[PDB]
Design a protein around this ligand. Structure first.
Ligand SMILES: [Cl-]
Ligand SMILES: [Cl-]
Ligand SMILES: [Cl-]
Ligand SMILES: [Zn+2]
Ligand SMILES: [Zn+2]
Lengths: 70, 146, 77
């Protein structure tokens, strides 16, 4: 949880910045304003709540399989 | 899990893949039925294959359990319809929707791994006599899938 | 000269400008540029079958407006 905690995170802002990723592939729901997003070293983003649970049992990015601890 | 499963169902309706359909059998969202069309120009061409899908309570943090109910001849799929495929076990990712899973399974049909077989006898034929493999696979397709 | 569509792993569809003579490796490279997934983790599917590196789009009879599906590298066992 510590390691996971240290991975970069930020709250989504639809207006300020348009990102190529608009949705969380874990819950299959859109990113919405103020939600906490977690960004893995491969630069793929997810809802923190969603990918944090995945990272508890797995070390890899859901999208590219990249090691998240690297 | 339930909200995600409904999301899967919506994805399928809006943007269906050409060789696959799936959905809840009953009103139970955790038990689905699926169909895969045998790919063209293969021993499975013309075939229609039915499958069953059971989502675990922790989906999608764990893979769906997927099995053929239509008999099929293949090194990686046994007489019980069990499919031995890595994305269904340790290589699972939540990015894989049931649609992407069924497509993956469809693609396994013509891309078997005879070197790590579920059914050794079938793998042996595949490696030693390919025409014989293709002939039997077509026979099973004609008998069971048509 | 032609366009094809790729259903990606990120929950959307992208359009690529390609040619019949383009290799599958070349297409995977473009996908990596857009989606940030390395080619070795990419498995492209068209008409129910995997597309193999070393072949071209024309080898698979992939015509204009075709839809390819991107899934993750897999192996039977
Ligand atoms: Cl839920
Ligand atoms: Cl079994
Ligand atoms: Cl495995
Ligand atoms: Zn999410
Ligand atoms: Zn990634």
């Amino acid at each position: 949880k510590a390691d996971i905690e240290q991975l970069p995170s930020y709250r989504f802002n639809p207006n300020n910045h348009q990102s190529e990723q608009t949705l969380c592939v874990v819950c299959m729901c859109d990113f919405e304003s103020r939600q906490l997003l977690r960004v893995l070293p491969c630069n793929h983003e997810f809802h923190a709540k969603c990918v944090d649970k995945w990272l508890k049992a797995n070390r890899t990015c859901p999208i590219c399989r990249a090691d998240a601890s690297e | 899990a339930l909200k995600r499963i409904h999301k899967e169902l919506n994805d399928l309706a809006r943007d269906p893949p050409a060789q696959c359909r799936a959905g809840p059998v009953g009103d139970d969202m955790f038990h689905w039925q699926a169909t895969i069309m045998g790919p063209n120009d293969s021993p499975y061409q013309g075939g229609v294959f039915f499958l069953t899908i059971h989502f675990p309570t922790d989906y999608p943090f764990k893979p769906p359990k997927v099995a053929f109910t239509t008999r099929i001849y293949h090194p990686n799929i046994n007489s019980n319809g069990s499919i031995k495929l890595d994305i269904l076990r340790s290589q699972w990712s939540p990015a894989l929707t049931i649609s992407k899973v069924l497509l993956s399974i469809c693609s396994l049909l013509c891309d078997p791994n005879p070197d790590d077989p579920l059914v050794p006898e079938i793998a042996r034929i595949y490696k030693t006599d390919r025409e014989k493999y293709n002939r039997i696979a077509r026979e099973w397709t004609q008998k069971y899938a048509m | 000269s032609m366009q094809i569509f790729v259903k990606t792993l990120t929950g959307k569809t992208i359009t690529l400008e390609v040619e019949p003579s383009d290799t599958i490796e070349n297409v995977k490279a473009k996908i990596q540029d857009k989606e940030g997934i390395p080619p070795d983790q990419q498995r492209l599917i068209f008409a129910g079958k995997q597309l193999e590196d070393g072949r071209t789009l024309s080898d698979y009879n992939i015509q204009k407006e075709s839809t390819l599906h991107l899934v993750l590298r897999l192996r039977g066992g």
